[PDB]
Amino acid sequence: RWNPSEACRPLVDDAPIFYPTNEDFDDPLGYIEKLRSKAESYGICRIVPPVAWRPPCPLKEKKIWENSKFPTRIQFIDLLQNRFGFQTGPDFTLAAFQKYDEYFKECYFQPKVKDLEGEYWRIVEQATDEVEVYYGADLETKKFGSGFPKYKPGYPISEADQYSQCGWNLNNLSRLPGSVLAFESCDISGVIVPWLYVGMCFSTFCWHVEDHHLYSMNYLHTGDPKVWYGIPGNHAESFENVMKKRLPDLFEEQPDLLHQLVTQLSPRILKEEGVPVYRAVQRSGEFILTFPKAYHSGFNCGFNCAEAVNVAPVDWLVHGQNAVEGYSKQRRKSSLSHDKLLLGAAMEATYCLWELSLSKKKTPVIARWKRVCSEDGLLTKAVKKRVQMEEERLNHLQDGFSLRKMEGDFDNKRERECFLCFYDLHMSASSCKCSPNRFACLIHAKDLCSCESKDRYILIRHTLDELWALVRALEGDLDAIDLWASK
Amino acid sequence: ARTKQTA
Ligand SMILES: O=C(O)CNC(=O)C(=O)O
Ligand code: NI
Ligand SMILES: [Zn+2]
Ligand SMILES: [Zn+2]
């Protein structure tokens, strides 16, 4: 079935490879920050942990390895580009799936990374035969278990425990201080709680971008290499355009195709269309970091098991903004409450500034938060933009509307979204006497009803004065700092 | 419920 004489390996520039020191590795977010300036223009990068950093995989317990059942979905590789979704495949265990992968590669190739690459793209671009594989993707680790260890109180001290509390343990990365995802109380699946990816040969994850343009960290626990292709975030649009240009009929059929994660396009074609693509080979025991709005794709060289999770340093806050705004224009539903994260971050930073005002002891956390807030600070800039947006949106409301101050438990329990935008309304909501428990964003308050303003009101979580007070507090306004440290 | 995307 293999045909190496017709291989179509795409000759693509390598994504940068980093070799963090133990020092660097003690501070995940800091290290990611230093990485930013060096690899953000590449979209993705490969991170090799310091020597002998190899956390034990609990999935290798044969109690889980041979018994824990997980679902798979069927991928027709020859259909990924030229031609729709993935259909329900048979249940597997890690043992079973590894055995079938061995069987598959034995049948298909009777095999190094570039051979598998050339053959894969051979199948995708040109289509001799139907090739059908399975992927156990997007498996909940809270259901299945994590590839990382957890703390067990009653048992002897072990390196496993140290790994369990390590920051690069993907169960711990999302809510590290410096990541605004910490301010989301719900253990959002995939975004905050890591997801598992069990692979076989040719197993694909098609072109896509993280939800809310978040950072993505992917650890390969065990098995064969995972090949990655990444696009820089600042070329995202370009990429998209090329898709529209090179798969016209598929986009005539599905204008929302990109968000469906079932379409693959070769890096060769992308290079010939002027889109910068960068290659990375993730081997067992290594990390792959995806930057905000960095389109990425790739496949598996054989049986493996990966674990991915989102992370959101302060620098992400400007992208995460655009995203939700974009979502509003796409009228697509979100995965998280952005304003909750922004406001949460601002509140924590204000708390730290308040502590410094009391000449409290400066901790590393306090330092990290102070460092990103002042009239030059990224957090300050983000909050400032959001507040400006708020004031313009309110300014554009015609006079009539009443104000009711939103009670704090307004987003707890229930996600509240603009009926038209699906814009998250954690900060502001508009309504009328026509529609209790039915709201719009400040931009679409107009479109909610036909009623006159007498009946129109707006739930506000914070008055405009209070918001501007927050911006001033980040810039050192002690009174404002006192104000927001109380909330 | 609250979730990441799936193909
Ligand atoms: O590995 C996979 O199957 C897909 N991974 C991701 O999309 C990721 O880590 O962000
Ligand atoms: Ni991804
Ligand atoms: Zn709206
Ligand atoms: Zn009305």
Residues β-bridged to residue A47: A18, A287
Sequence-separated contacts (24+) of A384-388 with Cβ below 8 Å? A384/A471, A385/A318, A385/A321, A386/A321, A386/A339, A386/A342, A386/A427, A387/A464, A387/A467, A387/A468, A387/A470, A387/A471
Could you tell me if A211 and A191 are in contact, meaning their C-beta atoms sit under 8 angstroms apart?
Answer: yes
Could you tell me if A391 and A317 are in contact, meaning their C-beta atoms sit under 8 angstroms apart?
Answer: no
Kindly give the distance from the C-alpha atom of residue A24 to the centroid of ligand 2, in angstroms, as a whole number: 25
- Angle of helix A338-357 versus helix A364-371 axis, rounded to 10: 120
CB A205 less than 6 A from any atom of ligand 1: yes
Q: What does the alpha-carbon distance between residue A37 and residue A40 come to, in Å, rounded to a whole number?
A: 6
Residues whose CB is less than 8 angstroms from the CB of residue A471 and which lie 6 or more positions away in sequence, other chains included: A380, A383, A384, A387
Pocket test for ligand 1, best of A44, A197, A209, A289 (most atoms within 8 A of CB): A197
CB A216 less than 6 A from any atom of ligand 1: yes
A156 phi, psi to nearest 5 deg: -45, 150
Q: What does the alpha-carbon distance between residue A43 and residue A13 come to, in Å, rounded to a whole number?
A: 12
Closest-approach residue (CA) in chain A for B5: A211
Residue whose tokens read 């306004």: A477
Q: What does the alpha-carbon distance between residue A334 and residue A327 come to, in Å, rounded to a whole number?
A: 7
Experimental determination technique: X-ray
Could you tell me if A188 and B2 are in contact, meaning their C-beta atoms sit under 8 angstroms apart?
Answer: yes
Rg of the Cα atoms in chain A: 24
Q: Residue A253 burial by CB count (10 A; 0-12/13-18/19+): exposed, middle or buried?
A: exposed
Q: What does the alpha-carbon distance between residue A151 and residue A433 come to, in Å, rounded to a whole number?
A: 52
Could you tell me if A478 and A387 are in contact, meaning their C-beta atoms sit under 8 angstroms apart?
Answer: no
Report CB contact under 8 Å: A85, B7. yes
- The sign of the CA dihedral A399, A402, A403, A407 is negative
Contacts of B4 in chain A (CB under 8 A): 138, 188-191, 195, 211, 310, 335
Residue A85 touches chain B, beta carbons under 8 Å: yes
Kindly give the distance from the C-alpha atom of residue A400 to the centroid of ligand 4, in angstroms, as a whole number: 13
Distances (CA, A) of A118 to A11, A44, A75, A145, A274: 10, 21, 18, 34, 21
Q: What does the alpha-carbon distance between residue A471 and residue A252 come to, in Å, rounded to a whole number?
A: 45
Q: Is A338 annotated as a binding residue?
A: no
Residue whose tokens read 């340093």: A313
> Of ligand 1's atoms, which has the minimum distance to the CA of residue A218?
9
Sequence-separated contacts (24+) of A379-382 with Cβ below 8 Å? A379/A314, A379/A317, A379/A345, A379/A346, A379/A349, A379/A474, A380/A471, A380/A474, A380/A475, A381/A318, A382/A314, A382/A317, A382/A318, A382/A321, A382/A342
Report CB contact under 8 Å: A335, B2. yes
Q: What does the alpha-carbon distance between residue A390 and residue A2 come to, in Å, rounded to a whole number?
A: 59
- CA A193 vs. chain centroid, Å, equals 11
Q: Report which of A172, A230, A219, A179 is spatially closest to residue A30, judged by C-alpha positions.
A: A179
Domain interval for residue A241: 4-316
Out of B3, B4, B7, whose CB is closest to A86?
B7
Q: Check which CATH number belongs to the domain holding A52 and give it.
A: 2.60.120.650
Report CB contact under 8 Å: A261, B6. yes
CB A342 less than 6 A from any atom of ligand 1: no
Q: What does the alpha-carbon distance between residue A186 and residue A184 come to, in Å, rounded to a whole number?
A: 6
Q: What does the alpha-carbon distance between residue A259 and residue A102 come to, in Å, rounded to a whole number?
A: 32
Q: Is A441 annotated as a binding residue?
A: yes
Q: What is the DSSP letter of B3?
A: B
Resolution in A: 2.9
Q: What does the alpha-carbon distance between residue A225 and residue A469 come to, in Å, rounded to a whole number?
A: 51
Residues whose CB is less than 8 angstroms from the CB of residue A401 and which lie 6 or more positions away in sequence, other chains included: A430, A445, A453, A456, A457, A458
Q: What does the alpha-carbon distance between residue A258 and residue A239 come to, in Å, rounded to a whole number?
A: 11
Contacts of A190 in chain B (CB under 8 A): 3-5
Kindly give the distance from the C-alpha atom of residue A175 to the centroid of ligand 3, in angstroms, as a whole number: 29
- How many CA atoms within 13 Å lie on the side-chain side of A414? 10
Q: What does the alpha-carbon distance between residue A395 and residue A397 come to, in Å, rounded to a whole number?
A: 5
> Of ligand 1's atoms, which has the minimum distance to the CA of residue A208?
7
Q: What does the alpha-carbon distance between residue A473 and residue A374 come to, in Å, rounded to a whole number?
A: 9
Report CB contact under 8 Å: B3, A206. no
Distances (CA, A) of A105 to A111, A180, A224, A273, A300: 9, 43, 12, 33, 12
